[model samples]
Target: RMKQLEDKVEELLSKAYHLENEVARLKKLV
Candidate 1:
């Protein structure tokens, strides 16, 4: 369903945002 996919998309976006922040933090440490 479109609604389900919309929720899924938001979930993935949040996960990707977290991943990006984690990598950026690691980069700052280096």
Candidate 2:
């Protein structure tokens, strides 16, 4: 169960990172 939670956290972090990068790129456009 602990391993599963860790994997889930990693997945969320990866998604958040991608979203953050996308927003940063958009901010540069504006």
Candidate 3:
């Protein structure tokens, strides 16, 4: 159960990173 929780946390962090990167790119366009 601990491992599963860690995996989910990692996935969420990865997704957050991607979203932040996308936002930065959009800011540059505007």
Candidate 4:
């Protein structure tokens, strides 16, 4: 159970990183 939770957290972090980069790109366009 703990291992599964860690994996889920890592996945969320990866998604968040991608979203942050996308936001930065959009900001540059604006």
Residue lDDT tens for model 4, 1-30: 869999999899999999999999999999
* TM-score of each predicted structure versus truth: 0.77, 0.73, 0.80, 0.82
Report model 1's TM-score to 2 decimal places: 0.77
Local accuracy of candidate 3 as per-residue lDDT tens digits, 1-29: 86999999989999999999999999999
Task: Give candidates' CA RMSD values in order.
Answer: 0.8, 0.9, 0.7, 0.7
- The better candidate by TM-score, 1 or 4, is 4
- lDDT (10s digit) by residue, model 1, range 1-30: 879999999799999999999999999998
Write down the lDDT of every candidate, Cα atoms only: 0.95, 0.94, 0.95, 0.95
**Model 1: which residue pairs collide?**
none
Query: How many clashes in each candidate?
Result: 0, 0, 0, 0
- What ranking of all candidate models by TM-score puts the best one first? 4, 3, 1, 2
Worst 10 residues of 2 by lDDT: 1-10
Full-model lDDT, candidate 2: 0.94
Scored by lDDT, model 4 comes in at: 0.95
Cα deviation at 30, candidate 3, in Å, is 2.0
Total backbone collisions, model 1: 0
